Amino acid sequence: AQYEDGKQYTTLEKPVAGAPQVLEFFSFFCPHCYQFEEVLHISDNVKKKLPEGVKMTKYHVNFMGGDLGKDLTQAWAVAMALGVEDKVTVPLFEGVQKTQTIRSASDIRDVFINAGIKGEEYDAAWNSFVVKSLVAQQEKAAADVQLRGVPAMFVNGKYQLNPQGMDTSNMDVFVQQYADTVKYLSEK
Amino acid sequence: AQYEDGKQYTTLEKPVAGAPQVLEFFSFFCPHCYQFEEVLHISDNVKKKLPEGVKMTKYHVNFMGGDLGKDLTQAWAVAMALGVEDKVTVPLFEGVQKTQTIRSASDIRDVFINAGIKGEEYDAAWNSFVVKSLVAQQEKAAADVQLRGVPAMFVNGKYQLNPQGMDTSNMDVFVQQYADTVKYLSEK
Ligand SMILES: Cc1nc(-c2ccc(C(F)(F)F)cc2)sc1C(=O)O
C-alpha cells in the first residue's frame, strides 16, 4: 500500500478540534452499515490494528429513520452510557433489518432487557443528563465533519476514510486495506 | 384520520389521463426504497388493504446511480416482462446497497441467473423490443407526474402520497397510515 491524499482517504477542508481519535458513524437502518459491522467486522478489525492507547468511538445518526431513528440514536447513547455496545449492537442490527422485531422504542428497550440490562436501569439511563448530552454529542460530531452519509470513519478530526478507492475483489482484503489505512492515519 | 391535502398526500396540478390506479416509483439505489421493500413491505401492505382487482404498478427510475442506474431500469423491464419481480427484488437491492457487489450490467445478469432465470432467456429479454417499450413506458410515466424523487406513489394519476406527513415513531403504525391513505385516495 502507498498512501495518497484522495486515494485511501480524503482530508477535511475544516479540521475538527478535540474530535475522537477514531470516529465511526453508522445507522441501524443502514444496509451497508449492517454489512460493515455484522459481516465485515470493520470496527473490530480496525481496533485490532490500532496503536495501543488509541480508542475507537462510534456514533449513531439518523438519515432515514424519522422519530424511530431518533429513538435509536438515544438508545445508542444509552448503550454508550452503560458500556454495553458489545452486547446490543448485534440484536439491534438483526432486530431492525433481519427479523423485523424492532418496530418501536419499546422493542429497543426489550433488546436491552434481554441482553441483561434491567428495565429500571435502562429507563434511568434513557432519561439521564449523561444520555441527553451524548445525544447532543453525536449530532454535533456529525455536523462538525459535515457528514453526508454512512458508514463513515474519521481519524483525528482531519482525515476521512475513502473505501471507494480500495480493493473489493475480496472482502477479507478490503477489511485489511481499510484497517491498515486507519492505522496509517492514526500514526500521522 | 383527518385527511388533509398537504398532510398525508398532495394533489397533482395537472392529473394524468389513463394513469395506473396505483403507481409506485423506486430505485435500487434509493435507501428509503430499500426500507420500503425489506422492512416495511409497503407494496404488500397496500395491496392487502386495497380491494381485489385494483391494479398496482411499480416502475424503476433513472436518476439514481449513473449508468448502472439506467441498466437497472432496463433490468426491471426484463423482470416485468418475465414476471420475476419477486425473484430479483431482494438480491438487486442487497447487491446494490448492502454488499455493493453489483457494479455492472454483468453483475445484474448474474443476479437473474442465480434467481433461477435461464441466461439465454435473460439475454433475449434484455435485447427485446418488448423490454425497450417497457423502458420507455417507465420513463414516460415518471415524466407524466413530473417525478422528482423516490420512493413515490401516485393514486389514479391525481394524488401523491406524502410519507413525510405521517407518524414515524412505530414502523407498523407508519405502514398502516400509509396503506390507509392509499385506500382513502383510491375511493375518492
Ligand atoms: C419516504 C420517507 N419514508 C420515511 C420513513 C418511513 C418509516 C419510518 C419508520 F418505519 F421508522 F416508522 C421512518 C421514516 S421519511 C420519508 C421522506 O421522504 O421524508
mmCIF file of C-alpha atoms in Angstrom, chain B residues 50-165:
data_model
loop_
_atom_site.group_PDB
_atom_site.id
_atom_site.type_symbol
_atom_site.label_atom_id
_atom_site.label_comp_id
_atom_site.label_asym_id
_atom_site.label_seq_id
_atom_site.Cartn_x
_atom_site.Cartn_y
_atom_site.Cartn_z
ATOM 1 C CA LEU B 50 -56.938 -2.480 -1.362
ATOM 2 C CA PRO B 51 -59.861 -4.383 -2.918
ATOM 3 C CA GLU B 52 -59.127 -7.470 -5.007
ATOM 4 C CA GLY B 53 -58.949 -6.134 -8.553
ATOM 5 C CA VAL B 54 -57.146 -2.845 -8.040
ATOM 6 C CA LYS B 55 -54.067 -2.916 -10.264
ATOM 7 C CA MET B 56 -50.750 -1.995 -8.664
ATOM 8 C CA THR B 57 -47.845 -0.956 -10.878
ATOM 9 C CA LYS B 58 -44.201 -0.443 -9.893
ATOM 10 C CA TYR B 59 -41.611 1.270 -12.090
ATOM 11 C CA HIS B 60 -37.861 1.840 -11.726
ATOM 12 C CA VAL B 61 -36.326 5.292 -12.297
ATOM 13 C CA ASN B 62 -33.133 6.506 -13.939
ATOM 14 C CA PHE B 63 -31.921 9.422 -11.856
ATOM 15 C CA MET B 64 -30.029 7.453 -9.203
ATOM 16 C CA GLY B 65 -26.801 5.548 -9.816
ATOM 17 C CA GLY B 66 -25.316 6.846 -13.067
ATOM 18 C CA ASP B 67 -25.009 4.400 -15.966
ATOM 19 C CA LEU B 68 -25.722 1.445 -13.713
ATOM 20 C CA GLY B 69 -28.959 3.257 -12.885
ATOM 21 C CA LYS B 70 -30.134 3.080 -16.499
ATOM 22 C CA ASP B 71 -29.096 -0.583 -16.615
ATOM 23 C CA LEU B 72 -31.242 -1.326 -13.565
ATOM 24 C CA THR B 73 -34.237 0.322 -15.212
ATOM 25 C CA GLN B 74 -33.723 -1.986 -18.199
ATOM 26 C CA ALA B 75 -33.276 -4.913 -15.841
ATOM 27 C CA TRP B 76 -36.537 -4.051 -14.085
ATOM 28 C CA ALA B 77 -38.189 -4.017 -17.527
ATOM 29 C CA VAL B 78 -36.811 -7.528 -18.001
ATOM 30 C CA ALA B 79 -38.222 -8.553 -14.616
ATOM 31 C CA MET B 80 -41.668 -7.187 -15.533
ATOM 32 C CA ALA B 81 -41.578 -8.843 -18.945
ATOM 33 C CA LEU B 82 -40.611 -12.224 -17.484
ATOM 34 C CA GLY B 83 -42.811 -11.807 -14.415
ATOM 35 C CA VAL B 84 -39.968 -12.456 -11.997
ATOM 36 C CA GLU B 85 -40.071 -9.219 -9.987
ATOM 37 C CA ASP B 86 -40.431 -11.115 -6.714
ATOM 38 C CA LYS B 87 -37.415 -13.281 -7.535
ATOM 39 C CA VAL B 88 -34.966 -10.451 -8.120
ATOM 40 C CA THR B 89 -36.074 -7.501 -5.986
ATOM 41 C CA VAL B 90 -34.205 -8.528 -2.843
ATOM 42 C CA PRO B 91 -30.917 -9.634 -4.416
ATOM 43 C CA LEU B 92 -30.862 -6.481 -6.578
ATOM 44 C CA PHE B 93 -31.445 -4.252 -3.540
ATOM 45 C CA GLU B 94 -28.839 -6.051 -1.474
ATOM 46 C CA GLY B 95 -26.369 -6.311 -4.351
ATOM 47 C CA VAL B 96 -26.521 -2.548 -4.845
ATOM 48 C CA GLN B 97 -26.828 -1.212 -1.296
ATOM 49 C CA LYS B 98 -25.818 -3.925 1.165
ATOM 50 C CA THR B 99 -22.880 -5.861 -0.295
ATOM 51 C CA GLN B 100 -22.206 -3.403 -3.144
ATOM 52 C CA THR B 101 -21.364 -6.327 -5.420
ATOM 53 C CA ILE B 102 -23.488 -5.026 -8.277
ATOM 54 C CA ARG B 103 -21.170 -2.768 -10.268
ATOM 55 C CA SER B 104 -22.040 -3.526 -13.893
ATOM 56 C CA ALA B 105 -24.700 -4.939 -16.211
ATOM 57 C CA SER B 106 -22.924 -8.292 -15.938
ATOM 58 C CA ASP B 107 -23.435 -8.311 -12.166
ATOM 59 C CA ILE B 108 -27.128 -7.610 -12.702
ATOM 60 C CA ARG B 109 -27.269 -10.540 -15.114
ATOM 61 C CA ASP B 110 -25.635 -12.810 -12.518
ATOM 62 C CA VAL B 111 -28.401 -11.948 -10.060
ATOM 63 C CA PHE B 112 -31.067 -13.078 -12.515
ATOM 64 C CA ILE B 113 -29.121 -16.312 -13.212
ATOM 65 C CA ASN B 114 -28.809 -17.053 -9.504
ATOM 66 C CA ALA B 115 -32.507 -16.323 -9.015
ATOM 67 C CA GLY B 116 -33.275 -19.141 -11.458
ATOM 68 C CA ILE B 117 -33.739 -17.218 -14.701
ATOM 69 C CA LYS B 118 -32.058 -19.055 -17.568
ATOM 70 C CA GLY B 119 -29.251 -16.997 -19.092
ATOM 71 C CA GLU B 120 -30.405 -17.288 -22.696
ATOM 72 C CA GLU B 121 -33.867 -16.189 -21.592
ATOM 73 C CA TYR B 122 -32.480 -13.154 -19.781
ATOM 74 C CA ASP B 123 -30.423 -12.134 -22.808
ATOM 75 C CA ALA B 124 -33.344 -12.483 -25.221
ATOM 76 C CA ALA B 125 -35.448 -10.328 -22.913
ATOM 77 C CA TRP B 126 -32.654 -7.794 -22.325
ATOM 78 C CA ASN B 127 -32.363 -7.118 -26.060
ATOM 79 C CA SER B 128 -36.074 -7.350 -26.880
ATOM 80 C CA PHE B 129 -38.267 -4.545 -28.169
ATOM 81 C CA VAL B 130 -40.909 -5.583 -25.630
ATOM 82 C CA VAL B 131 -38.365 -4.596 -22.978
ATOM 83 C CA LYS B 132 -37.343 -1.479 -24.916
ATOM 84 C CA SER B 133 -41.004 -0.431 -24.816
ATOM 85 C CA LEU B 134 -41.259 -1.128 -21.073
ATOM 86 C CA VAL B 135 -38.208 1.093 -20.536
ATOM 87 C CA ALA B 136 -39.947 3.851 -22.497
ATOM 88 C CA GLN B 137 -43.142 3.268 -20.500
ATOM 89 C CA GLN B 138 -41.344 3.693 -17.167
ATOM 90 C CA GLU B 139 -39.643 6.877 -18.341
ATOM 91 C CA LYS B 140 -42.840 8.361 -19.781
ATOM 92 C CA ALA B 141 -44.829 7.592 -16.618
ATOM 93 C CA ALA B 142 -42.282 9.413 -14.441
ATOM 94 C CA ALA B 143 -42.265 12.354 -16.839
ATOM 95 C CA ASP B 144 -46.078 12.467 -16.759
ATOM 96 C CA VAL B 145 -46.183 13.022 -12.986
ATOM 97 C CA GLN B 146 -43.103 15.275 -13.070
ATOM 98 C CA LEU B 147 -41.249 12.845 -10.815
ATOM 99 C CA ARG B 148 -38.519 14.431 -8.693
ATOM 100 C CA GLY B 149 -37.545 11.654 -6.299
ATOM 101 C CA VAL B 150 -38.179 8.181 -4.934
ATOM 102 C CA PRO B 151 -39.907 6.450 -3.280
ATOM 103 C CA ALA B 152 -43.134 7.837 -4.689
ATOM 104 C CA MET B 153 -46.669 6.565 -5.044
ATOM 105 C CA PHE B 154 -49.449 8.015 -7.138
ATOM 106 C CA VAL B 155 -53.150 7.182 -6.999
ATOM 107 C CA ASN B 156 -55.273 7.468 -10.148
ATOM 108 C CA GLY B 157 -52.736 9.933 -11.549
ATOM 109 C CA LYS B 158 -54.282 12.531 -9.242
ATOM 110 C CA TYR B 159 -52.723 12.214 -5.798
ATOM 111 C CA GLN B 160 -49.191 11.701 -4.493
ATOM 112 C CA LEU B 161 -48.505 10.014 -1.152
ATOM 113 C CA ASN B 162 -46.728 12.186 1.423
ATOM 114 C CA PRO B 163 -44.997 9.890 3.955
ATOM 115 C CA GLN B 164 -43.233 12.912 5.484
ATOM 116 C CA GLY B 165 -46.579 13.933 6.964
#
